[PDB]
Amino acid sequence: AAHIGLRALADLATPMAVRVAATLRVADHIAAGHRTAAEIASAAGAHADSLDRLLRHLVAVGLFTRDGQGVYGLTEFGEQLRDDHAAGKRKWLDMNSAVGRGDLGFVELAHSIRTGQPAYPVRYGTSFWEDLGSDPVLSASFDTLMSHHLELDYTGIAAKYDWAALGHVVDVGGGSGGLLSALLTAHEDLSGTVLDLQGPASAAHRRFLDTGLSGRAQVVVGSFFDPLPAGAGGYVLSAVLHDWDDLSAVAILRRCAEAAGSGGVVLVIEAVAGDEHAGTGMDLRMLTYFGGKERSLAELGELAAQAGLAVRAAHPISYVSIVEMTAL
Amino acid sequence: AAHIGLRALADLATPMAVRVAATLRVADHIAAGHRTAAEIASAAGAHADSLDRLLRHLVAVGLFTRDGQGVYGLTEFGEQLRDDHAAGKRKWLDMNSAVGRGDLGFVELAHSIRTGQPAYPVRYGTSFWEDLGSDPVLSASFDTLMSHHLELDYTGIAAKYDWAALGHVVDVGGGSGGLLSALLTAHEDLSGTVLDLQGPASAAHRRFLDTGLSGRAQVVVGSFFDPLPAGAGGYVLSAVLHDWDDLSAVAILRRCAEAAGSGGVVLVIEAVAGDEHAGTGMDLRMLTYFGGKERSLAELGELAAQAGLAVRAAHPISYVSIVEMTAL
Numbered sequence: 001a002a003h004i005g006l007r008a009l010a011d012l013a014t015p016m017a018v019r020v021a022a023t024l025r026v027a028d029h030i031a032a033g034h035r036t037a038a039e040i041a042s043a044a045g046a047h048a049d050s051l052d053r054l055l056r057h058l059v060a061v062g063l064f065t066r067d068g069q070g071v072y073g074l075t076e077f078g079e080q081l082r083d084d085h086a087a088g089k090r091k092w093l094d095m096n097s098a099v100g101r102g103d104l105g106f107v108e109l110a111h112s113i114r115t116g117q118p119a120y121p122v123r124y125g126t127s128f129w130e131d132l133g134s135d136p137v138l139s140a141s142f143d144t145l146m147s148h149h150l151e152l153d154y155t156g157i158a159a160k161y162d163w164a165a166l167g168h169v170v171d172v173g174g175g176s177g178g179l180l181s182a183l184l185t186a187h188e189d190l191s192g193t194v195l196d197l198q199g200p201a202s203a204a205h206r207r208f209l210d211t212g213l214s215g216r217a218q219v220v221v222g223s224f225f226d227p228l229p230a231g232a233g234g235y236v237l238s239a240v241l242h243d244w245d246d247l248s249a250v251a252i253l254r255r256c257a258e259a260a261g262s263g264g265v266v267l268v269i270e271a272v273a274g275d276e277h278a279g280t281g282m283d284l285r286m287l288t289y290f291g292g293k294e295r296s297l298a299e300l301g302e303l304a305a306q307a308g309l310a311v312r313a314a315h316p317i318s319y320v321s322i323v324e325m326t327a328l
Numbered sequence: 329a330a331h332i333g334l335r336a337l338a339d340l341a342t343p344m345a346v347r348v349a350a351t352l353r354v355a356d357h358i359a360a361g362h363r364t365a366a367e368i369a370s371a372a373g374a375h376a377d378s379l380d381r382l383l384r385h386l387v388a389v390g391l392f393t394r395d396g397q398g399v400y401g402l403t404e405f406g407e408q409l410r411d412d413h414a415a416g417k418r419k420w421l422d423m424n425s426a427v428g429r430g431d432l433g434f435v436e437l438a439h440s441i442r443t444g445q446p447a448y449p450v451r452y453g454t455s456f457w458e459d460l461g462s463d464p465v466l467s468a469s470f471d472t473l474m475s476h477h478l479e480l481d482y483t484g485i486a487a488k489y490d491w492a493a494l495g496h497v498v499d500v501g502g503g504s505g506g507l508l509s510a511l512l513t514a515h516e517d518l519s520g521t522v523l524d525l526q527g528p529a530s531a532a533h534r535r536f537l538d539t540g541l542s543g544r545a546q547v548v549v550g551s552f553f554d555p556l557p558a559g560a561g562g563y564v565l566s567a568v569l570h571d572w573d574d575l576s577a578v579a580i581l582r583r584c585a586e587a588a589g590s591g592g593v594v595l596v597i598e599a600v601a602g603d604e605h606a607g608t609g610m611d612l613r614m615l616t617y618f619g620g621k622e623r624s625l626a627e628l629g630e631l632a633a634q635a636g637l638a639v640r641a642a643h644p645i646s647y648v649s650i651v652e653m654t655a656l
């Protein structure tokens with residue numbers, strides 16, 4: 001990019017206008033029949049006049065079309081704004097979801113860049129997890145979004161690795177049990193345990209009960225900073241490490257190392273720096289949310305090193321990687 | 329006219345990253361001689377490693393360039409990020425200027441389009457003017473910024489209208505007197521008085537003293553919501569009306585009508601919703617800041633009506649318009 005005006009490249013009005021449309025579900029109200037500002041507004045519960053000005057800006061962006069007596073219609077693009085779209089982006093943009101709300105934490109980016117600390121707290125006076133831990137509905141939405149990322153990224157991951165060979169896997173921080181689920185459903189004879197906080201663990205359990213996996217699927221509420229269910233064949237750290245700073249990440253890694261002993265493997269499944277799903281933007285998001293960071297195969301090794309582990313493999317999956325570490 | 333991906337359209341990381349680069353004067357430190365994250369960060373007072381991550385993202389965006397070993401350079405675009413660049417953009421983005429800080433108020437857009445009220449208060453617990461009133465340095469930056477818009481928008485306005493014919497003009501909300509100054513520096517037998525709040529008025533006065541215009545130019549501190557210096561030839565309302573909602577606008581207008589009388593002429597000089605610079609993004613900004621509105625020649629006319637005035641001309645000069653109203 002960068003071919004657009006510097007002021008345009010720095011524009012906030014548009015990205016904010018798009019996010020607001022997503023939150024009012026304007027695209028849904030248009031397809032559902034309400035095609036004029038007065039209607040969409042009363043339908044979404046917005047200020048009729050102000051809402052019109054928003055739309056006008058959005059027809060200009062190329063998300064909506066307006067004509068004659070001000071009848072709005074989604075464009076080939078605006079289509080992606082409705083909840084029932086394949087992509088399922090509206091939920092990430094909606095300002096009520098964990099991510100849609102948390103991304104507004106970017107307005108405090110300056111803080112992070114000046115102190116190397118998360119900016120989310122500067123905006124919401126608390127850590128992201130603390131926030132999700134005290135808002136069940138918010139935490140619920142995060143579980144939903146992460147569940148969605150499993151699809152977008154881990155397509156066919158069950159096959160790309162020799163899971164069965166593990167016998168029993170602990171999904172450290174595998175909230176909502178989507179990955180473990182997709183893993184067991186694809187490899188019978190294999191059992192697992194999802195370890196996460198009350199919120200996700202409660203959803204993982206609910207999941208296994210319905211998919212009829214409670215026989216091989218176990219849940220255990222707890223922090224991955226404390227001893228983990230020891231002796232498993234494998235310990236997966238899926239989309240966890242990048243959520244933490246270096247110190248924390250090695251702590252998390254050691255716990256896995258310990259529980260794994262000289263008999264198991266520690267599989268970190270993340271978007272290592274270089275993957276088609278790992279950008280500088282994700283890294284910035286990681287920094288602004290918790291002061292985490294995307295890391296390279298190299299940087300992960302430096303960490304594994306400080307935990308008594310050693311990278312022995314790296315198989316690239318669909319958009320991310322499966323870094324396999326064992327004790328050294 | 330925006331084909332790039334929805335997620336990219338709603339992106340906040342980049343706009344914020346640019347604004348932070350502006351505020352940290354990153355481009356200036358690079359051209360000055362600090363080409364390394366560690367250097368540029370120490371020269372900017374930022375956190376070395378965090379900044380490196382920001383730069384990396386801005387390199388990716390296309391504003392900077394990096395060689396191995398972390399050396400950075402400005403791209404042809406990165407230039408515009410310099411504080412001495414022709415455009416003079418950096419200061420509008422800087423989070424310390426009235427606008428660079430006020431735009432972060434967009435993060436509360438949802439509130440405005442939801443209620444019709446301004447959003448700036450939501451984020452700063454006060455109005456824009458209240459803020460500038462209690463922060464003289466802030467107000468100072470706003471004065472210089474608007475001064476900059478004079479050059480960008482009003483280029484040649486001197487001749488575009490028969491000023492000298494008015495004898496004496498009162499620039500209602502004249503700011504630091506940049507406009508009035510230009511008009512007098514072009515019409516030797518023309519006198520005028522700038523009306524504004526303490527902050528701008530004294531900057532206007534300081535100007536007239538350094539440019540020997542104190543003889544034909546004077547300032548008067550006061551709210552344009554109370555009686556104005558009466559009997560002038562013309563009353564100019566430059567970039568004022570769109571900073572206000574309709575009711576407040578007719579208020580300000582009635583005052584001008586009154587002051588002018590059956591013998592004066594009220595001149596609204598602002599980018600009508602019509603064309604050029606005025607846009608939906610501007611209109612959104614006006615709503616976000618004060619519940620203001622960018623209006624059409626009709627919308628203005630409707631307002632003038634309520635103030636006993638009647639549009640009688642509209643010479644489009646440069647990228648904005650000067651609509652001449654008189655008592656009906």
Ligand SMILES: Nc1ncnc2c1ncn2[C@@H]1O[C@H](CSCC[C@H](N)C(=O)O)[C@@H](O)[C@H]1O
Pocket residue numbers: 129146147150172173174175176179195196197200222223224225237238239240243
């Ligand atoms: N201290 C802690 N102990 C255990 N789990 C934690 C934790 N802090 C955060 N988590 C969990 O770490 C997970 C990271 S988010 C996504 C992780 C999951 N493997 C996935 O990609 O879907 C979340 O489920 C979060 O609830």
Ligand SMILES: Nc1ncnc2c1ncn2[C@@H]1O[C@H](CSCC[C@H](N)C(=O)O)[C@@H](O)[C@H]1O
Pocket residue numbers: 457474500501502503504507523524525528550551552553565566567568571
């Ligand atoms: N109640 C009030 N009375 C007088 N001036 C006011 C005011 N409220 C705001 N202003 C001034 O209105 C101006 C609007 S922005 C700058 C306008 C200037 N004519 C540039 O004339 O084009 C600012 O200078 C602001 O300080």
Ligand SMILES: O=C(O)c1cc(O)c2ccccc2c1O
Pocket residue numbers: 099102149239240243289
């Ligand atoms: O896209 C992902 O994989 C991803 C993973 C995460 O663990 C996140 C945690 C907090 C916020 C966003 C996250 C995120 O976007």
Ligand SMILES: O=C(O)c1cc(O)c2ccccc2c1O
Pocket residue numbers: 427430477567568571613617
């Ligand atoms: O561009 C302009 O003419 C303009 C005029 C204004 O009165 C503003 C007031 C507050 C914030 C931005 C403003 C602005 O950008």
